[PDB]
Amino acid sequence: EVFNATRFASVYAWNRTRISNCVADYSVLYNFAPFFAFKCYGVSPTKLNDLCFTNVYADSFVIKGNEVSQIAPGQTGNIADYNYKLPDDFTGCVIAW
Amino acid sequence: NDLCFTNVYADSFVIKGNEVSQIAPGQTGNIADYNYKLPDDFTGCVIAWNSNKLDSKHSGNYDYWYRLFRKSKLKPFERDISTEIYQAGNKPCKGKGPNCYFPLQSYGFRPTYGVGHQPYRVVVLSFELLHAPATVCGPKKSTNL
Amino acid sequence: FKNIDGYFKIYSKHTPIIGRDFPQGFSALEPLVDLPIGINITRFQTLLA
Numbered sequence: 001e002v003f004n005a006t007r008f009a010s011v012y013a014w015n016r017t018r019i020s021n022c023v024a025d026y027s028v029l030y031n032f033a034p035f036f037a038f039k040c041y042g043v044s045p046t047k048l049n050d051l052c053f054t055n056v057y058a059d060s061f062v063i064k065g066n067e068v069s070q071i072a073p074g075q076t077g078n079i080a081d082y083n084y085k086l087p088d089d090f091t092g093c094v095i096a097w
Numbered sequence: 098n099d100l101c102f103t104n105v106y107a108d109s110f111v112i113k114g115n116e117v118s119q120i121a122p123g124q125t126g127n128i129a130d131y132n133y134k135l136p137d138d139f140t141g142c143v144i145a146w147n148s149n150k151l152d153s154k155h156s157g158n159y160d161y162w163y164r165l166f167r168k169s170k171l172k173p174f175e176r177d178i179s180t181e182i183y184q185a186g187n188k189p190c191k192g193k194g195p196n197c198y199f200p201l202q203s204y205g206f207r208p209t210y211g212v213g214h215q216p217y218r219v220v221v222l223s224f225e226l227l228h229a230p231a232t233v234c235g236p237k238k239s240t241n242l
Numbered sequence: 243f244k245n246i247d248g249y250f251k252i253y254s255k256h257t258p259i260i261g262r263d264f265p266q267g268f269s270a271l272e273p274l275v276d277l278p279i280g281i282n283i284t285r286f287q288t289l290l291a
């Protein structure tokens with residue numbers, strides 16, 4: 001329901017969905033999107049299915065091409081400063097398709 | 098400076114700030130598991146000093162590299178230099194893009210990051226304190242037997 | 243030969259023995275060289291004359 005959405009909000013108002021009380025199988029994320037940026041910072045992309053997380057936040061927003069590389073901890077730009085800023089200590093992954 | 102070591106191995110590589118905390122016997126992380134792994138019975142020294150003057154320039158520098166995608170874990174003191182796209186699902190895919198990911202991504206460095214993202218220059222020193230003809234010593238006196 | 247933690251170890255003992263071949267009398271082995279290669283080895287081959 002976060003990857004089959006039809007109206008992913010803009011970056012200026014990034015919808016934040018709270019994911020809890022569920023088993024997080026990432027193959028359902030793997031099959032829904034032909035990725036182009038599945039970079040991870042705090043955890044290993046191969047090693048997601050063997051960890052338990054207290055809570056998972058899924059911020060979804062459609063954005064331009066270069067801005068995909070813009071979105072990363074410790075970055076700059078018109079989006080990284082005024083629209084969405086990833087904290088330097090980010091423990092999670094980003095997905096772009 | 099008052100020991101005798103059979104042989105000494107010096108491994109040198111630049112890693113990021115948190116990665117210095119990662120580098121230690123049997124730690125966890127894509128560097129400790131896919132990029133470099135020390136033996137658990139390690140007998141040596143790790144050396145880490147900040148280098149923002151040799152690994153940074155205006156307009157950025159993306160020269161360095163590191164591996165996040167490896168078929169298995171890294172055995173201690175083993176190099177896995179190779180460019181093979183990680184398999185996802187069941188596709189024998191060979192290329193970049195969706196579910197065909199390059200194993201190694203850039204370690205891009207700029208003069209302006211946070212300390213945890215600064216270019217830390219790490220060299221490790223490995224000793225071998227066993228019963229064998231040593232090679233390396235320090236100050237010495239040659240009193241007659 | 244073996245490659246425990248690098249440090250290529252070579253042991254030897256010559257004896258134009260019985261001449262039979264793999265003989266049976268016991269024989270120790272005296273190391274000759276021990277050199278720290280520290281590489282990956284998986285396959286083996288021999289040269290001829």
Ligand SMILES: *[C@@H]1O[C@H](CO)[C@@H](O)[C@H](O)[C@H]1NC(C)=O
Nearest residue numbers: 001002003004005031032033
């Ligand atoms: C949405 O769900 C349908 C029904 O299972 C599926 O066929 C489709 O691939 C899904 N699309 C996305 C983007 O998740």
Ligand SMILES: *[C@@H]1O[C@H](CO)[C@@H](O)[C@H](O)[C@H]1NC(C)=O
Nearest residue numbers: 001002005007008009015017
């Ligand atoms: C998130 O908010 C946007 C607002 O435009 C909406 O279009 C989208 O459907 C929402 N996604 C959810 C609730 O999963």
Ligand SMILES: *[C@@H]1O[C@H](CO)[C@@H](O)[C@H](O)[C@H]1NC(C)=O
Nearest residue numbers: 172175176177281282283284
């Ligand atoms: C050495 O190479 C072989 C063949 O690729 C591989 O099976 C083995 O795991 C490697 N091991 C080490 C110690 O590098």
